[PDB]
Amino acid sequence: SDFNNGWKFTLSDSVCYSFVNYNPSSWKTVNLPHDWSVDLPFESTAEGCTGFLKGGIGWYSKTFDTPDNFVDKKCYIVFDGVYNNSEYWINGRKLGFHPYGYSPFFYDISDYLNPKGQENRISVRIDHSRYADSRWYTGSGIYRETQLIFTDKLHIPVWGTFVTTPVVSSERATVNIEVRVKNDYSGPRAGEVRTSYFDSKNKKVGEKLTSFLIEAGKEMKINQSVEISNPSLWDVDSPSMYLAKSEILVDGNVVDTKETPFGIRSIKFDAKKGFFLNGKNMKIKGVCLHHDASMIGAALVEDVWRRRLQTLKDGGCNAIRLSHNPGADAFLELCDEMGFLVQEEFFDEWDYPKDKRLNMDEQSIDYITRGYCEYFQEWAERDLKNVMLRSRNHPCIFQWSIGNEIEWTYKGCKESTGFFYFWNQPPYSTQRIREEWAKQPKQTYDIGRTAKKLAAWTREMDTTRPVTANCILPSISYETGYIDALDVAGFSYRRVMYDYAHKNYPDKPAMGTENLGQWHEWKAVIERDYIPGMFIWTGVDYLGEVGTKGREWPQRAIGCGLLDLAGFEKPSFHMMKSLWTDAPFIAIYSQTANKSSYVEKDGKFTDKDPKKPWTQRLWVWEDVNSHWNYTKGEKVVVEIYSNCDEIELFQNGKSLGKRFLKDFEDHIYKWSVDFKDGNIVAKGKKNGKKTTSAIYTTKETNSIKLSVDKVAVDANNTDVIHVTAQLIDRNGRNISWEEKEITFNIGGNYRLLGVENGDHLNVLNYKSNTVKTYKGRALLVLQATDKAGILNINANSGSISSNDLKVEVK
Ligand SMILES: OC[C@H]1CNC[C@@H](O)[C@H]1O
């Protein structure tokens, strides 16, 4: 009996759909979360900024009976995210409107419920007709989970606790909680708040009892403090979680309860020395993530994200930037449990709109790009705070970011620099910048004033995490009062400004908040103790931000991600793994000496194009080869991404010679090689400890190798199976040099989530059991249902057959 199951949905729109007497039984049944945009095909006539998928106007409905014991109680319906411009009705009557696609909210439906036993009905209209109102793919509908909460009239409201730990040592932590208590009875009520604390193994480690008297219709804040001895500290390598169980008592009887998971950890940003987690000075190995996972779209399916994060974590990542909007509660829960530090961003724009198709300031105006900027003046406060009410207990969250690249949207910011920029500092001095800024004409809104209001609102809700922002032009935001509102200046693609921040504003902590997946970005981080990390754009590829010149149909994604749309490890991931992890590691790629970005003359490698050198490489990694399957005798440049200080390369057993990481300024081991069928083997050492990796020439495609991440799942409507298809030759050696059209067949009760191959440059039907491979591989994503049973999975490509998999559903 989960409230998220058995919803009705339709991609239509009629005025009668909310009426007391309208029956939606003819509508399709769905389980939340749901994103309808991915059930529509990739169209050439949709907008590339939102991933070539239309929105439209859609509706949901949900019936539920009033409990037999709904007397002296309240009812709250809670949404964690609905995209967007959504309207809410219960039993014929309007509850309200909610513009923003990413903030959570709730309605008090207590007085609307029909008497004990009888049926109630919620209706949601979603207006995603403005299907280009975003620079990236959004999806459509109730894409995060919902809740139906019943409480006593004396109760902790929704999100009614805030747990903090202002003193943290290894002997003890001071753990404070604020329990709000609302009395919705018509007379005064006396009681007690009992809050019990519990560890990893459910042993009670603390307790506090406080008395209260609260007047009719008033809300009271009860603060309680305890000392937790020898705490298990939450860390990225040891994410231990505690539980606060706060109970409201009348007489001696529990009348309401809230459970507040939390962690005990200290965080500190030091402007001279860097970032400190529980007293360990560590670098932030961050990645940026949008909210979609391809076949599922915006629908928050946890197992799908678990796999992607596990991969990211195996690559060394310890932090996540939620670009450029509030994340899902369930995603933050995943981060608490798995161990990532999380920057949650409130907005992508404030007073003035960005161009949705092109980046930066809005140049054109049309109906379908009309976004949240229309509601920002009235809604920014309610939204920012609700996000924080919802999010603030999660130990993962270590930064609140009030805005991304805002400077583009205000007349005078870019002008007041000297630039009109990636690779230079500004030609104007700090005073000259300030003088230019004073010379610009007054707009209706100011970047500084709005920064202050947002920073101030933020601090009313939480002072235990720093305020930051991703500043694209720090030089001017240092002078407008914007950076002055922040505790941590975040720099979008400004490694060339780290020395400038230290020199000119040393007492303000600074950091990479958006960066390129390249060694030259990380070199700049580890050479500076005052720059504690970076956040790569992006950790995993995402739908949208295409359709521009150079990236026309049928391209869906940019390909800037470390992981592709299937969550498979790309070349850029293995470079970062070679920089972010310590256990010895070698990845072997190559290109034709023609296609390679490097060239050997006199036994020494340099960049081909000196106007495109290694220090200026941008978002998308070159299309390099993992195979060893060229034509005989062709000249090849083997490029290796490794943490080994010495590697020796063998071609069929003949030693090509040892090389040293010290000799390669761009952190890439290189060899010139004359291709002949066989194998390449790299043997390397990282301070004495050895490791070996190799690639093999294969014969033509023989079989389909199928792997499964789990051989058993539960019949809970939510567990995911990820099936990986990989082409192999007669001897089982992996193919990546030719593609095949693979048809999966599955027996037993399952729900298809879909198929992906990781090709950013080409569309495909998500809902087909057939998928073309990319780099010899593909992914099929299935989901458990109500029905237990066995699933028999196999595949073919005409002649080409496969091994057979069996997965139980318990
Ligand atoms: O792909 C380029 C990126 C630049 N910085 C902001 C991101 O949202 C994105 O537009």
Side-chain angles (χ1 to χ4, degrees), residues 369-410 412-431:
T369 58
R370 291 318 85 193
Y372 176 69
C373 193
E374 195 173 339
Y375 299 90
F376 182 77
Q377 296 313 311
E378 294 305 307
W379 284 91
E381 171 158 23
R382 273 173 287 173
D383 283 334
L384 179 140
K385 292 190 170 175
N386 273 9
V387 173
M388 289 183 91
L389 281 173
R390 189 275 315 262
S391 288
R392 68 188 176 176
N393 291 312
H394 287 275
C396 67
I397 295 176
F398 89 141
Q399 297 180 329
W400 304 105
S401 175
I402 56 159
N404 175 59
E405 310 193 330
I406 303 296
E407 296 99 314
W408 297 133
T409 61
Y410 290 90
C413 285
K414 73 186 201 207
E415 293 85 354
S416 291
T417 66
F419 294 119
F420 319 91
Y421 74 108
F422 261 51
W423 312 119
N424 306 91
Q425 309 193 342
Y428 299 168
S429 62
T430 55
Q431 192 183 307

Side-chain angles (χ1 to χ4, degrees), residues 7 36 56-60 79-89 94-107 122-130 133 140-143 146 372 375 379 383:
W7 284 69
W36 86 67
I57 303 184
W59 284 70
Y60 291 81
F79 298 89
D80 202 50
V82 184
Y83 206 103
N84 66 351
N85 305 121
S86 50
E87 298 180 302
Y88 295 75
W89 283 269
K94 192 75 181 287
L95 290 181
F97 171 78
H98 184 85
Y100 200 33
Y102 295 111
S103 57
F105 56 105
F106 62 80
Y107 290 107
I122 294 147
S123 306
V124 186
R125 181 176 188 272
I126 285 134
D127 183 348
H128 192 200
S129 59
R130 304 162 185 77
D133 72 6
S140 306
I142 307 179
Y143 75 96
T146 73
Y372 176 69
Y375 299 90
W379 284 91
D383 283 334

Side-chain angles (χ1 to χ4, degrees), residues 135-136 290 321 323-324 348 354 359-360 404-405 408 422 470 472 492-493 514 537-538 542 545 551 558 560 619:
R135 301 179 307 104
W136 63 88
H290 275 294
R321 178 155 169 242
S323 45
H324 301 295
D348 186 48
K354 292 209 182 100
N359 213 328
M360 316 188 208
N404 175 59
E405 310 193 330
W408 297 133
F422 261 51
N470 190 46
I472 188 55
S492 196
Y493 309 102
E514 212 183 294
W537 193 268
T538 50
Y542 60 96
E545 207 181 325
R551 296 167 173 165
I558 297 170
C560 56
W619 285 269

